[PDB]
C-alpha cells in the first residue's frame, strides 16, 4: 500500500496562487508520511530544465509553517526551455538523474499543458535520451512511465475542466477587502468605484466579485456587451443616482472587450460615466494585490485536501492510467483526466476567438453561465408581468449567521421577479408567532449581501410552544411557503411543522430550510451558509496567536473554538492553522490520548517548530476543558516550552461573510425559492395549496456534488437531536489529514480518495 | 463656565475622510454634556446654504454607534454656492435662523479656507442680511459674531499649518494593507509594483507609505526628480535585481511631475520599468479606497480629543479671539489661527506653482523634508567614506513589541552611514551576557520594516545577575555605545548599568533606550514603540465582538485587556470602540462604583442602543476579576441584558506593526542614532570613551511636543518599580472624555485644552 521505494517531485509554475504552499506542505508531507521520497522542484520548469540544484529532497520540517504563507517558497518561473524539446528532454533527464517517476504540478492552464504535453513525450523524450547517450538502456526501461497528477493553482479559473481552482477564494477575498473599504463607510458623495480585475482572459473573477459586491455593471470576455451599451450602461447608473444609491460599482475585467475584438479600458468607462453622469469616478487596479495576502481558510484546507488527494492518486497509479487533474467539483474530490481537461481550454480558447463565440460561455462551466444570470436577475428589477396567488414568508432562525442576509436578499429579488408576493418575518419564529410579518421589496434588501449577522432578526424558539399562533399568522397572512434561513433550530421548527401537519391544516405549507450556522450543524448539507466566515475568522485569529512568540520564545496555545458539539468548526481550522490537534466531541480522547498528544507536542517542540497549537472545540469533553489541557501542557512541558490560552468567543461569529459565504447564500437562496415555486406549481390544486408530503418539506442541500432537497422527516433518522447536529457528518475524514500532516501515525485505511470522471462535456 | 443658552453647529465638507464621524460625535456629545445645543448641518456648505431640512438639532442618540464608521453620516458635498456671496448670505442666514453663532467645521483645506472666508464676511453678510429685510435689527446685534473651531478633516494633509489630520492615519492603513499583500508572501518571480496614491497636489501620502513601506523609489509633488531620473530609477532597480531582491516597490503620487509642469504617469513608470528592466510591473491604483474601511484606532482617539478641544475652544471664545484650528502637533493639542494657516497654504501653492519651488518643500513643513531625507537614507545604501573608530551594539529587551525591528533597522542604516561599526545582540541582555553579538551590515536588516515580533531576540532577564558577563562582552566586542529598544525592563536594564558605572569602568558607554513596549508603560514616552498596534489590533477585535450580538439582542460584552497594571491600553481603547467603561489600575473602583456603571448600563440597554461594552485591565483589580464583573452585570442586567466574556489574550500582541509604528520607530531609531553618535563625540576624550555623567543614558522621548531625551535617572523618580509603570502618565486626562462620551456626569476642570499658538513661520 505505502508508497516506498518510489520518489514524488513537485513543482509550482505560472502566476504564483496563495494557498500553492498549502498544497506543496500537503503533498511533501504525505509524500513521506507514505514512505516515499519528496523532491522540491524550486522556480518550476525552470529548475526542472536546469535541475542540480534547483531539485532538493524535501524533509518533514521543509515545509514547516508555510501555510499561512501566500505566494509559494518553492518558486515558480516562466521557461521557454520546457516548450521545446532541447529544454524538455534536460528536463526528463533531470528526473531520471533523481529517479522521480511522480511529478505533482500545482499551477494554472499552461503550466498543466506543458505537463500534459511533457508525459505525451516521456517515452520518446527517453528514447532520444538513451540514443544520446545520457542515460543507459537499463535505468530507462525503469522510469519508463511518468506519472502526472495536476493541481490547479491561479487567480483565473481557466482550466475549463475544474470548477474550482487554488487560489481563486483568496483572490476574491482581496477583492472584497477592497471592495468593503467602499460600501462599509457612510457613504457621502455621489460616486462611481470601477474596480479593474486582473483577468486578461477569464471573466470568473470579474463575475464572482460583481455577484459578491451586487456591482451595477459587468465587463467579462465571456459575455461582450451588446452594441450600444454605453448609453444601456448610463442610463442604469441613472435610475440608480434617482433611487437615492449613492455609489455605483462597475467589475471590468482586464480582458473586457465588445462584441468585435476592441478591448473595453476602465479608463473608457471611468471616462463615459464622468462625461453622462458627471459622478466622482475612479478607477481601482489592484494589480499584483489579487495574488496577494494570505491564502483564505477554504484556500488552506482545499489545498491540503488535494495536495493529499494528488499523492494518493500518483501512487495508486499503473503504467496505463492517464495524467490527471485532482479537483473538487462541489464537495466531492474528484480526479480528471489531464488531456481532456487541455482539450475542452483548446476548445472554448478557439469558441472565444469568434468561431462559437456566443456558445463558448456555456463550455466554461455551467456555474460560470449560472453565475452571470443570477448576477443580472439580482443586479436589475425586470418588470414581472407574471403574476401568481402564491405568497411566502421568509425567516431567520437561531443564531446569526453571515450569509443569512444574502440569501434573504436572493429570496426577495427571485421571488418578486416569479410573482410571488414575499414576506419577510423578523425575529423568527417568534415573529411568526407574534404576527410580525412584513411584506418586502426589490430594493427593501438593497445592499444586504456584504451585511453580517441577521437584518431580520434570529431567535432560537422552536414553533412547538406558539403553534396556534404560528398558524393563526399563517392564515391572516396567506403564507402558501415558508423560508427559513438558519441553523439546527431552523431544520427542528421546520420539522415540527411537518409533524404537526397532522393536527393543522394550515400548516400544510411548502416548507424549505437554509442551513445558515456558524457549527456546521445542520443535517442536509455539507456547508452551513456563514461556517466559511466563522473559520476563516478563527483561524485569523489562531494565525495572529501562533505569531505572537515571534520565532523566538517556544510556546503553546490552547485556542478555544466554538460549534456547540459539532466539531466542524475545530477541524478545519486546525487544518487552516497547522495545529498539531483539534480536539471534538466526535474523537473522544482520554488522558492516555493527551499524555500521547503531550509528549508529541513536547518532542516537536524540540525540534526547529517552536510554535505550538492545539484547539479545543468548546464541548468536546466534559471534564478535560481548556483550563485542564492548559495545566496538563504547562506541567508536562515544563522546562521545554509554556503554555497560553485563549478563548475565542463571538470573534468568530459578527463579521462580514466572506466572498464564498455572499455567493453561496445568494446561489442556494435563489435555488430554494426556484425549489418553492416548482413545489407550490406541483402542489397547487383544487384551488388552493396543500401540502402534506414529506418531500414538500426540505433542506437545500449542497450534500456531495451538487445542490440537494433532503425532506426534513428522512433526516429526522440522521439527526442527533441532543447533541443538535447529524449522526453522520461528512468531514471526519479530515481528521486524519490534520492528524498526518502533525506526524501523527494514523493508519488512514478509512479515508477515500476521488476516482476517475471524464469531463461533463 | 457650561456653554447654555448658546447653540453650536457642526458639518462635513470635501472628501469624506475617515474618522470624521469620531469628530462629529465628540462634538456632538461634549456641545449637548456641557448645555450647549447642537446642530447637525448635511451635506456640508451645500445643506448651509439650502438651510431648513438639512440643519437638524443633535441628541445623545443621533451619533450613537458611529464611531467606527468611515466616511461621514453627516454626509459632505461641494457647493459653488459658498464660494459666492448669494450662498454664503443664505447661509448666514439659515445659522442665524436657528441662532448658531458658534460654527466646527471638519474638512479639508478649501473647507477651513472657506470657513475663514465666512467669519471674515460675518459682519458685512449679516448687514446686508438685515439691510435686505431678512432678519431685524434686533436679532442681528446678537450673532453678530460667528465663532470658527476648525478641523483638519482630509486624506491629504495639505494643510501646512497642521502637523497631522483625521484620516491620514486610515488613509495609510489602506496603503499599507495592500503593500503588505505584496511583500508578506513568498517572493516567486522578479516583479515590480507600482502604487499609485492620491497625491495629486499633495504628496505627504506617498511620503509615509513609501517610508513605511521601504519603497525603492518615490515620486512626490514637493520634490520632482532631477533630469535624467529615468536611467537612476532603472539602475536602482537594477542593482535591487541584482542584490536578489525579487520585488520593487514604486510610489507615485498622483501629482507626481517632473522639474517642468509635465506629470508623470504610473503607466509611464509601468512601461519605462518594463522597457529596460522586463520585471513583471503592474500598476495599483488604490482610488476610492483610500477614504475607505474603517478608521484607525489613531484617527478614532484623535477625531475624539480634537472634536471635544474644538467645542471647549468654542465656548471659551470670545469675540476678539480669531477664528482657529485645533490640531495636535506632537502628542500635544494645540489651537491655530485659521488665517495664519490659510496664508501658509496659499503661500505654499504659490511656491509651488515654480516661485519658489526648490524651497517650497521646507515651507510643508519640518516633518515633510525630515521624513524625505530619512527615506532617501534609509532607501539606498550610498557611500560612507567618513569613518569612526566608534561601535555600537543594538539590544532588544521584554517583550516583543510591533516596530522593534522598524527601529533596529533604521539605526543600523543609520549607524552604518554614519561610520559606526554597528552590532546587534540576540536576546537581549541574556545575549550581551553570552557574548551572541553579531556585527550587522546594511542588507541584513532588509525587510524588517513590516515585520512584526522581534528579528533580534527578546528576553526580559536584566543585566544586574550577568553584569561580569555584560562587562566583559563591553570589553571583547569593543562597545563604546549601547540602543536598547523595549520595554520597562530596556530602561530598568540601562537604569542598572548607570548605577554601575561606579563598580565597573566599562559600563561608561553611551546608552540610549528606544522604549517598545504593548503597554505603553515606560517612563521618558508617550507613545511606546508597538502600543498604537497593540490599541488598533485590540479595537479590532473589540469592534467584531461588538457587532456579533447584531443589532435585536441586548448585549453586554466584558472584554479583558493586556498592558499590566498600565491602562494605557484599555482607556485609549474604550475610547477607540465607545466602551461604557475601562477599569484600570490607576482609577482605583469599589463595589459602589460598579453598581453606578451597571445601572448606568441597564438604563442605556432599555434605550435604543443594544451592544454595551466594558473593558477591563487585566491588573485593575486584586478581586474584581473579568469573571466577577460577568457575574455582576449579568446578574443585575437580568431581563434587560445577556453578558458575555472575551479575554483578548495575545491577539493584541503578535501582530504587523502598523504604519505609525513603522514609522515612528524608523524615525526615533534614526534619531536615536543621531544622538548616540553626537554624544559619544561630546564624551570621546583621552582617545577613550568615558561616558559617566547621567545625561550619557537617556530614553528617547516623544514626551509632550517633540522628541525628548530623558536621563533614566532623573526618571527614576517618576518610575512605580513595583507596578512597572510611570507614576504620572499624561493619559489619565483623556479617562474624563471616555467617561462624557459614555453619558458619566464626571466634573472635568482637570482637562486642560491648547491654547492658541502662532504657526512656526
Ligand atoms: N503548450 C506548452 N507546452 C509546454 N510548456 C508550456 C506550454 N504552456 C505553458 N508552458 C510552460 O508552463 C509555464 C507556465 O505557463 P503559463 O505562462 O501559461 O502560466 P500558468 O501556468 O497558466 O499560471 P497563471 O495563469 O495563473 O498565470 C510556462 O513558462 C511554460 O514553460
Ligand atoms: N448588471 C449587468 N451587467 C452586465 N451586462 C448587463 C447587466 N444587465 C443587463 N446586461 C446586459 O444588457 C443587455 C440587455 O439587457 P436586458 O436584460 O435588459 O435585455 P434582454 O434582452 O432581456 O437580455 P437577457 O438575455 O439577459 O434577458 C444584455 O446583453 C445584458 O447582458
Ligand atoms: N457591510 C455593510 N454594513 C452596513 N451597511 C452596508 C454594508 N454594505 C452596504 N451597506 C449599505 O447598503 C446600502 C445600499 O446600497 P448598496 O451599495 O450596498 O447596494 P444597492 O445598489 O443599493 O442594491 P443591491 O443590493 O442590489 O446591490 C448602502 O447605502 C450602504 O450604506
Ligand atoms: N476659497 C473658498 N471660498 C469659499 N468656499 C470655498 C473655498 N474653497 C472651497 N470652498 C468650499 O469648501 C467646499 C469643499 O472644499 P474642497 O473642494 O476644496 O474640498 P476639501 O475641503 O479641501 O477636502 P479634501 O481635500 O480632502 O478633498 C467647496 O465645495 C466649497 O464650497
Ligand atoms: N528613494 C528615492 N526616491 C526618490 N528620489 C530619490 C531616491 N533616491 C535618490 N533620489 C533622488 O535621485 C537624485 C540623486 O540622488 P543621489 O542621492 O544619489 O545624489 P545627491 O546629489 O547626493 O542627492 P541628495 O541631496 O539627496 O544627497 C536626487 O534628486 C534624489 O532626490
Ligand atoms: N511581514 C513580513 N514578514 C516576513 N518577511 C517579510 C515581511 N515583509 C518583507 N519580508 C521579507 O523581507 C525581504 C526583503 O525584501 P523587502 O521587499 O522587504 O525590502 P528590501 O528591498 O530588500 O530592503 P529595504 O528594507 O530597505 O526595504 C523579502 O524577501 C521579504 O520576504
Ligand atoms: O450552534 P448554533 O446554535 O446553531 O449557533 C452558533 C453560536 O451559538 C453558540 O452556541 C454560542 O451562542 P451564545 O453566546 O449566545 O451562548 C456558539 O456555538 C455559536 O456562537
Ligand atoms: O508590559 P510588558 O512587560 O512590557 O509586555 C507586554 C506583554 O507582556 C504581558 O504581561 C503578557 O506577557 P506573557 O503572556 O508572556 O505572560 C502583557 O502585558 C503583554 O502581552
Ligand atoms: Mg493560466
Ligand atoms: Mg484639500
Redesign the pocket.
Request: glycine residues 22%.
Given at each position: 500500500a505505502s508508497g516506498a521505494g518510489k520518489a514524488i517531485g513537485v513543482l509550482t509554475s505560472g502566476g504564483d496562487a496563495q494557498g500553492m504552499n498549502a498544497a506543496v506542505r500537503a503533498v511533501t508531507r504525505m509524500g513521506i508520511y507514505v514512505g516515499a521520497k519528496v523532491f522540491l522542484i524550486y522556480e518550476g520548469y525552470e529548475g526542472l530544465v536546469e535541475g542540480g540544484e534547483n531539485i532538493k529532497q524535501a524533509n518533514w520540517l521543509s515545509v514547516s509553517n508555510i501555510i499561512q504563507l501566500g505566494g509559494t517558497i518553492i518558486g515558480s518561473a516562466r521557461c521557454k526551455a520546457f516548450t521545446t524539446r532541447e529544454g524538455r528532454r534536460a528536463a526528463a533527464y533531470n528526473l531520471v538523474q533523481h529517479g522521480i517517476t511522480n511529478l505533482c504540478v500545482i499551477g494554472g492552464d499552461g503550466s498543466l499543458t506543458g505537463a500534459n504535453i511533457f508525459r505525451s513525450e516521456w517515452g520518446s523524450l527517453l528514447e532520444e535520451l538513451v540514443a544520446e547517450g545520457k542515460i543507459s538502456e537499463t535505468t530507462a526501461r525503469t522510469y519508463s512511465h511518468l506519472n502526472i497528477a495536476g493541481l490547479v493553482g491561479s487567480i483565473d479559473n481557466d482550466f475549463c475542466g475544474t470548477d474550482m481552482t487554488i487560489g481563486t477564494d483568496s483572490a476574491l477575498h482581496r477583492i472584497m477587502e477592497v471592495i468593503d473599504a467602499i460600501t462599509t463607510t457612510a457613504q457621502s458623495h455621489q460616486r462611481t468605484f470601477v474596480l479593474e480585475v486582473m483577468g486578461r482572459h477569464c471573466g470568473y473573477l470579474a463575475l464572482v466579485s460583481a455577484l459578491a459586491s451586487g456591482a451595477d455593471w459587468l465587463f467579462i470576455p465571456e459575455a461582450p456587451p451588446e452594441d450600444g451599451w454605453e448609453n444601456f450602461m448610463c442610463e442604469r447608473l441613472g435610475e440608480t443616482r434617482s433611487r437615492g444609491s449613492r455609489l455605483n460599482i462597475i467589475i471590468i475585467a482586464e480582458g473586457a472587450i465588445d462584441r468585435n475584438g476592441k478591448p473595453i479600458s476602465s479608463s473608457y468607462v471611468k471616462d463615459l460615466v464622468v462625461q453622462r453622469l458627471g459622478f466622482d469616478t475612479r478607477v481601482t487596479v489592484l494589480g499584483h494585490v489579487q495574488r496577494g495576502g494570505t491564502p483564505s481558510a477554504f484556500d488552506r484546507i482545499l489545498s491540503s485536501k488535494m495536495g493529499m488527494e494528488a499523492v494518493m492518486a500518483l501512487l495508486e497509479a499503473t503504467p496505463d492510467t492517464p495524467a490527471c487533474v485532482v479537483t473538487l467539483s462541489g464537495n466531492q474530490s474528484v480526479r480528471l483526466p489531464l488531456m481532456e481537461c487541455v482539450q475542452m481550454t483548446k476548445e472554448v480558447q478557439k469558441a472565444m476567438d469568434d468561431k462559437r463565440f456566443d456558445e463558448a460561455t456555456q463550455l466554461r462551466g455551467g456555474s460560470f453561465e449560472n453565475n452571470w444570470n443570477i448576477y443580472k436577475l439580482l443586479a436589475h428589477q425586470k418588470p414581472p408581468k407574471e403574476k401568481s396567488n402564491f405568497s411566502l414568508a421568509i425567516l431567520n432562525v437561531?443564531?446569526p449567521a453571515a450569509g443569512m442576509n444574502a440569501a434573504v436578499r436572493s429570496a426577495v429579488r427571485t421571488g418578486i421577479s416569479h410573482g410571488h408576493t414575499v414576506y419577510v418575518v423578523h425575529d423568527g419564529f417568534e415573529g411568526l408567532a407574534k404576527g410580525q410579518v412584513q411584506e418586502v421589496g426589490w430594493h427593501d434588501v438593497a445592499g444586504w449581501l456584504g451585511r453580517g449577522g441577521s437584518m431580520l432578526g434570529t431567535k432560537?424558539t422552536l414553533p412547538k410552544g406558539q403553534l396556534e399562533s404560528i398558524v393563526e399568522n399563517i392564515r391572516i397572512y396567506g403564507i402558501h411557503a415558508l423560508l427559513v434561513v438558519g441553523?439546527?433550530?431552523a431544520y427542528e421548527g421546520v420539522l415540527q411543522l411537518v409533524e404537526a401537519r397532522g393536527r393543522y391544516e394550515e400548516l400544510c405549507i411548502v416548507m424549505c430550510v437554509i442551513p445558515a450556522?456558524?457549527?456546521n450543524?445542520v443535517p442536509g448539507t455539507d456547508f452551513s451558509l456563514g461556517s466559511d466566515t466563522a473559520v476563516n475568522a478563527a483561524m485569523e485569529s489562531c494565525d495572529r496567536i501562533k505569531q505572537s512568540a515571534s520565532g523566538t520564545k517556544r510556546r503553546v496555545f490552547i485556542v478555544e473554538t466554538?460549534?456547540?458539539y459539532?466539531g466542524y468548526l475545530a477541524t478545519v481550522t486546525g487544518i487552516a492553522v497547522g495545529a498539531d490537534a483539534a480536539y471534538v466531541f466526535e474523537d473522544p480522547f482520554n488522558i492516555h490520548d493527551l499524555k500521547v498528544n503531550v509528549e508529541h507536542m513536547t518532542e516537536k517542540m524540540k525540534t526547529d517548530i517552536q510554535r505550538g497549537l492545539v484547539l479545543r472545540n468548546?464541548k468536546c469533553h466534559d471534564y478535560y476543558t481548556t483550563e485542564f489541557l492548559y495545566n496538563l501542557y504547562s506541567s508536562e512541558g515544563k522546562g521545554v516550552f509554556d503554555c497560553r490560552t485563549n478563548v475565542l468567543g463571538?470573534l468568530?461569529?459578527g463579521g462580514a461573510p466572506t466572498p464564498f459565504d455572499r455567493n453561496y447564500g445568494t446561489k442556494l437562496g435563489v435555488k430554494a425559492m426556484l425549489w418553492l415555486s416548482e413545489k407550490l406549481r406541483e402542489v397547487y390544486r383544487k384551488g388552493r395549496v396543500f401540502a402534506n408530503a414529506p418531500d414538500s418539506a426540505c433542506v437545500i442541500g449542497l450534500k456531495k456534488k451538487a445542490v440537494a432537497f433532503s425532506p426534513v422527516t428522512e433526516l429526522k433518522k440522521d439527526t442527533d437531536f441532543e447533541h443538535?447536529m447529524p449522526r453522520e457528518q461528512w468531514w471526519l475524514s479530515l481528521r486524519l489529514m490534520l492528524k498526518m500532516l502533525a506526524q501523527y501515525r494514523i493508519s488512514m485505511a478509512a479515508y477515500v480518495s476521488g476516482e476517475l470522471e471524464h469531463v461533463t462535456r
Open positions: 437561531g443564531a432560537r441553523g439546527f433550530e450556522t456558524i457549527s450543524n466554538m460549534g456547540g459539532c468548546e463571538h468568530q461569529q443538535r
